[PDB]
Design a protein around this nucleic acid. Structure first.
Ligand SMILES: [Mg+2]
Ligand SMILES: [Mg+2]
Ligand SMILES: [Mg+2]
Ligand SMILES: [Mg+2]
Ligand SMILES: [Mg+2]
Ligand SMILES: [Mg+2]
Ligand SMILES: [Mg+2]
Ligand SMILES: [Mg+2]
Ligand SMILES: [Mg+2]
Ligand SMILES: [Mg+2]
Ligand SMILES: [Mg+2]
Ligand SMILES: [Mg+2]
Ligand SMILES: [Mg+2]
Ligand SMILES: [Mg+2]
Ligand SMILES: [Mg+2]
Ligand SMILES: [Mg+2]
Ligand SMILES: [Mg+2]
Ligand SMILES: [Mg+2]
Ligand SMILES: [Mg+2]
Ligand SMILES: [Mg+2]
Ligand SMILES: [Mg+2]
Ligand SMILES: [Mg+2]
Ligand SMILES: [Mg+2]
Ligand SMILES: [Mg+2]
Ligand SMILES: [Mg+2]
Ligand SMILES: [Mg+2]
Ligand SMILES: [Mg+2]
Ligand SMILES: [Mg+2]
Ligand SMILES: [Mg+2]
Ligand SMILES: [Mg+2]
Ligand SMILES: [Mg+2]
Ligand SMILES: [Mg+2]
Ligand SMILES: [Mg+2]
Ligand SMILES: [Mg+2]
Ligand SMILES: [Mg+2]
Ligand SMILES: [Mg+2]
Ligand SMILES: [Mg+2]
Ligand SMILES: [Mg+2]
Ligand SMILES: [Zn+2]
Ligand SMILES: [Zn+2]
Lengths: 99, 95, 129, 144, 149
RNA sequence: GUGGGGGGACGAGCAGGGGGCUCCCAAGGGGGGUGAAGUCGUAACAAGGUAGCCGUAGGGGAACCUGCGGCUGGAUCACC
RNA sequence: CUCCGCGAGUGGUCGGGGUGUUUACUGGGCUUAAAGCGCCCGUAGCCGGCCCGGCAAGUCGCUCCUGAAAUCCCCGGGCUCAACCCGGGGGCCGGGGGCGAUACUGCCGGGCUAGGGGGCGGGAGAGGCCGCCGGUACUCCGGGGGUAGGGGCGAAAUCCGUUAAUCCCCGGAGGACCACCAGUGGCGAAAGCGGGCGGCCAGAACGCGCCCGACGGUGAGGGGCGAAAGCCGGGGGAGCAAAGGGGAUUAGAUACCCCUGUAGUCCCGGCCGUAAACGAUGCGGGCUAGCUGUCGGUCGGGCUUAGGGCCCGGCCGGUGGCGAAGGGAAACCGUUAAGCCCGCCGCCUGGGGAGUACGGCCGCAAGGCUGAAACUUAAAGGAAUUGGCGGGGGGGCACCACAAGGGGUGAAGCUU
RNA sequence: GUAGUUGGCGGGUUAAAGGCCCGCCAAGCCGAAGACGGGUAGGGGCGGUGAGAGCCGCGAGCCCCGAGAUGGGCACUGAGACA
RNA sequence: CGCAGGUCGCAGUGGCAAGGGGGACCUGACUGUUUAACAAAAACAUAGGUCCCCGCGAGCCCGUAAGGGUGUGUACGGGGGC
């Protein structure tokens, strides 16, 4: 599943310390943090740069925005997003409703 | 031995039934295998001599359907235990 | 999926004969069906074999005479040598005088009696009695 | 539920493999092929064996009957296993002593297991000190 | 599905047993062939081409009239298909499903429909390689066949 | 003919591990199963006295009880 | 004591064969007795439409070289017959050579459309995924009316209520569900799917002189989907409710009832991979009386709420009931077969020990899959019949029953 | 699973072909049509049983082939032995 | 970095430099801190778990007071226990 490990992939830097449960939590969060995300503006599948916690930057379109601590968009945050970036979905409705 | 070719519930060509809840109960069954007797129902029974055609008294009569399980249906006399030859005879359940 | 036409045709005769039918339609058909029915008609187990022409291969309509007690195709099509046919004879037939087997020999399809006179074996096809 | 299965003319090899697969469902075949008779039987595949009597012990007949069938405990010379051997005949236990070589042999019964009302005994004594117990019991010989 | 279907229908066209040229036909064998090429250059597939001939032009069957088949007729006049028409239809059906599955990853009903279609593709590739109508090295790569949509 | 040093192929044997394959002995326990009916209840068979059973989870001297979903092998082949 | 079987033999324990169609090629079974994997995609294998031409691999016929001797079968002869020995023929299931046949299988070539796939048309469908909206009901919250009960039960009690309850009205919030219509109705491979509108998909049925031309079936191993409970992390939480708390009942009551109550139930991502996952009935194809209800399509006739509507009849495809032939131990199945056949896969071989132990693999875990043996045992088991019995149903009857009555006995002394 | 393992080229040795052995080159060879591993067994002519298909090996004794001479190795002579 | 050949010693990482190893129990998870000058530990801390006081004009604490710390903070937070 991972490059050189079976289950402890991102958290393999910790070795055999800190406990399986603690390291397992790190693997769960870190896999989404270090995965591929869609930029909320350009919708590219790109590895966003996390400047700090809650600060994300898209290397393609340069979009800098506030998100989750380790993931660019939390579950609740994905519903209260600004509607300026909800233009594709808005026109998607107006194509369907008008046709 | 397989009593009844029906399996006790006229389900049909499906896999699962939505099922209901039993009044006076909750043991219940699926939508089939559940007794659904309907009775006429009306409040204030035969007062229509002194009511209705006395004052104005516009009275109402609401058809009510009741759902029961095999335990409650046998308990209230809606269902008997018929003989084997009588099991295949289709009789209405007195409404 | 339809695999062997001869077994299908021979079971149709068994089904239709057991209902006391006058005739039976057969479809689809090949030369092996025809050459077997000719051997059957030659031994009085089958009436006239009329042929019909459709786009789908053709049909045979066979008049039955109530002359069949049992019938069927031997499967698989076992090779048989001439000295062996006596052994296969008692396998599918009742009595030494009653019934025949249908063999597919290199000289053509014949009854097992006509194969014994020619002193040749072949590939077993069916039995009738 | 139809057409037994591998019936083709060129299905000989597959047909033989399928029939060999279900031979193992037969307990008799599996025991013979696995060498189970000669691994757990105290007689070790032989029809009889020698042994030394240790203690005269009595087993009780099964529930419908009522009796105390008089057997003996034997230790096999070739194995050292201890088995209970039935001493037959009226008064046959009186011809048995302690520390005497006896020839131990199967009691019969179904499948080499125990006999009718005797529970859990598979052997019976046939020889005591090199002379047959039936010979002693009939008077035709005397014990040495 | 392919197996364990609830219904096994019989719908098909009952053609005449030995079809011959219709006496009402106002088209020579050369006119019939040229009509098919115009439809083919228009872009209709060989299955739909025959429907237009019968429904619009009243040509019952191109085979008895011309002695050839529709793909053979179109083949002679330079109309060559990238793949056989049945195979190209199944490939286009997979792309339209795999496009659907992108935005709906949890469409389990559509996934099984993709698996049925993607197995029908594999059977036809096995057949077509044996008869040589497609190259022996042909591989169904869904990403390598995106142009066929 | 030889006697030393050595190199070579073959190769016993003795030292060691290494792995299995097996097989015994082992304080102590672990789940079991047979007797003959000793104790406590009465869980299953009838609507077995709370219809029964299957999977799963929790709980309890014990049989077992309860929650969820399923089955009739139900005590119903039957609404208007 | 007498009789029985065999007799220079006759017994005991073992092993093989028969027994035994309990290993089933001939020749078993799998609804309920043991036995169809929960469902499906498919590799090897096995099995595969029709016609024409070629080869002659299989196959068939003849012949040859062989398949040591002994052993085996037949015939003749010699020991007194016999066992045995000698002579001759056959076989000893096969290998190869030559010459012939081409019916079937195989291969090669050409051609078809009947199986299959791909299409076009109008319809059907709780088929799926996503978005938006609604319907009552419910619980809670705020306010107004009105006092004192409410709730619950077999009966109570716990409990809620005098900081205003239950009940009624005006508003708000929330989560789950989709009543009637509604059906042995529909869809789906199984699991499963029930409010409306919409978008994206899927799979079928019917109608067809549309396209390809056998492209097919089954499928070990391999893969994917797979109720409920449960596990991992996040959100949510109305009602219900394992565990727990309390009120009762009880001999006991860690149960059944009541009040309350937390996971859970719901959504998302992942895991688990089991179920009476059932039609206890594997998948594909053909043939074999019928009558009847209903769903989809279509064609013909008759009407029209002039409708995509209704009725009658035919075909195709589903879904129920009764029932030919036939089958079955029987219940029963019977064109939706458990009938007559053709294929392929899975499984079973008395009960218990036991879905246990060891090993392996899988899983976060719970656990799951695969899965014995020693030992013990003579039955376990299916269906059906007669009865017995039931805190099942129905009817009939009786002062050794009751109801309406009369007199009593049971207490004292005494007789027994 | 295999790493002289599978093959090629050149050699040595042999009475004689051969990864039999050696120098170099390559990555091949086997496997679910069941490798590899484990267990059991000398192979055949044949024998027992059954009406037969078949099942079993009493496939000990007689004949043919094989291997061995307390366990493991290595040589002399000789046409021939590693006796 | 490799290959081939020859060759000397008792000894070739020849001096210098430079791990003995293995099994098992108790105990603290671990890295970390500690009685300067007799105790380095199994003690303290720790990440993780959980409980309590608190909606900010709070809670807890300092100051005689003026006033201050937590606080350029706000429950995914501050403080207080285990
Ligand atoms: Mg179900
Ligand atoms: Mg016994
Ligand atoms: Mg195939
Ligand atoms: Mg009870
Ligand atoms: Mg409990
Ligand atoms: Mg409770
Ligand atoms: Mg059987
Ligand atoms: Mg099934
Ligand atoms: Mg299973
Ligand atoms: Mg398949
Ligand atoms: Mg030949
Ligand atoms: Mg002779
Ligand atoms: Mg011979
Ligand atoms: Mg499989
Ligand atoms: Mg669940
Ligand atoms: Mg409650
Ligand atoms: Mg709650
Ligand atoms: Mg089943
Ligand atoms: Mg049966
Ligand atoms: Mg019937
Ligand atoms: Mg199992
Ligand atoms: Mg295990
Ligand atoms: Mg009775
Ligand atoms: Mg009275
Ligand atoms: Mg008195
Ligand atoms: Mg050479
Ligand atoms: Mg070698
Ligand atoms: Mg000898
Ligand atoms: Mg030696
Ligand atoms: Mg020697
Ligand atoms: Mg030093
Ligand atoms: Mg420490
Ligand atoms: Mg330290
Ligand atoms: Mg100090
Ligand atoms: Mg110190
Ligand atoms: Mg500490
Ligand atoms: Mg901890
Ligand atoms: Mg404390
Ligand atoms: Zn961007
Ligand atoms: Zn009820």
């Amino acid at each position: 599943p991972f490059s050189h490990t079976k289950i402890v992939g991102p958290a393999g830097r910790y070795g055999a310390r800190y406990g399986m449960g603690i390291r397992r939590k790190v693997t769960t969060i870190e896999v989404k943090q270090r995965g591929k995300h869609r930029c909320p503006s350009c919708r590219s599948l790109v590895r966003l740069e996390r400047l700090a916690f809650g600060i994300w930057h898209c290397p393609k379109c340069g979009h800098t925005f506030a998100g989750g601590a380790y993931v660019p968009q939390t579950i609740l945050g994905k519903t209260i997003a600004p509607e300026e970036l909800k233009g594709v979905e808005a026109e998607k409705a107006k194509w369907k409703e008008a046709a | 031995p397989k009593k009844r070719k029906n399996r006790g519930r006229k389900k049909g060509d499906k896999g699962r039934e939505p099922y209901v809840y039993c009044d006076n109960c909750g043991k219940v069954v699926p939508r089939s295998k559940a007794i659904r007797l309907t009775v006429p129902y009306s409040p204030v029974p035969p007062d229509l001599a002194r009511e209705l055609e006395k004052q104005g008294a516009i009275i109402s009569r609401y058809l009510v359907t009741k759902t029961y399980c095999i335990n409650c249906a046998v308990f209230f006399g809606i269902i008997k235990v018929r003989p084997r030859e009588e099991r295949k005879k289709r009789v209405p359940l007195q409404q | 999926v339809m695999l062997d036409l001869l077994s299908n045709a021979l079971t149709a005769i068994k089904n239709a004969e057991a209902m006391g039918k006058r005739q039976v339609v057969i479809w689809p058909v090949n030369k092996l069906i025809y050459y077997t029915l000719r051997v059957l008609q030659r031994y009085g187990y089958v009436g006239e074999i009329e042929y019909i022409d459709d786009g789908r291969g053709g049909k045979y309509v066979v008049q039955l005479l109530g002359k069949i007690n049992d019938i069927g195709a031997i499967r698989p099509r076992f090779p048989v040598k001439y000295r062996e046919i006596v052994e296969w004879e008692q396998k599918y037939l009742p009595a030494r005088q009653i019934g025949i087997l249908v063999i597919s020999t290199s000289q053509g399809v014949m009854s097992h009696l006509e194969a014994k006179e020619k002193k040749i074996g072949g590939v077993l096809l069916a039995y009738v009695y | 539920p139809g057409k037994k299965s591998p019936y083709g003319l060129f299905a000989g090899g597959k047909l033989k493999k399928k029939r060999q697969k279900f031979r193992w469902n037969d307990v008799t075949y599996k025991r013979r092929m696995l060498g189970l008779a000669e691994k757990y039987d105290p007689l070790e595949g032989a029809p009889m064996a020698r042994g030394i009597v240790l203690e005269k012990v009595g087993v009780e007949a099964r529930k419908p009957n009522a009796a105390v069938r008089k057997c003996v405990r034997v230790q096999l010379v070739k194995n050292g296993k201890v088995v209970t051997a039935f001493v037959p005949y009226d008064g046959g236990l009186n011809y048995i002593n302690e520390h005497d070589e006896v020839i131990i042999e199967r009691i019969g019964g179904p499948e080499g297991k125990s006999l009718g009302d005797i529970p859990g005994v598979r052997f019976k004594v046939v020889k005591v000190n090199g002379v047959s117990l039936w010979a002693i019991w009939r008077g035709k010989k005397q014990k040495p | 599905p392919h197996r364990s279907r609830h219904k096994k229908g019989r719908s098909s066209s009952v053609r005449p047993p030995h079809p011959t040229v219709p006496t009402w036909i106002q088209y020579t064998p050369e006119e019939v062939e040229q009509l098919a090429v115009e439809l083919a250059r228009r872009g209709f597939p060989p299955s739909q081409i025959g429907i237009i001939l019968r429904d619009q032009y009243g040509i019952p069957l191109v085979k008895p009239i011309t002695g050839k088949k529709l793909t053979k007729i179109l083949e002679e006049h330079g109309i060559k298909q990238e793949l056989p028409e049945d195979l190209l239809n199944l490939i286009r059906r997979a792309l339209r499903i795999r496009k659907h599955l992108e935005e709906h990853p949890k469409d389990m009903a559509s996934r099984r429909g993709l698996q049925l279609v993607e197995s029908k593709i594999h059977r036809l590739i096995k057949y077509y390689k044996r008869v040589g109508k497609i190259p022996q090295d042909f591989v169904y790569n869904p990403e390598a066949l995106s142009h066929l949509a």
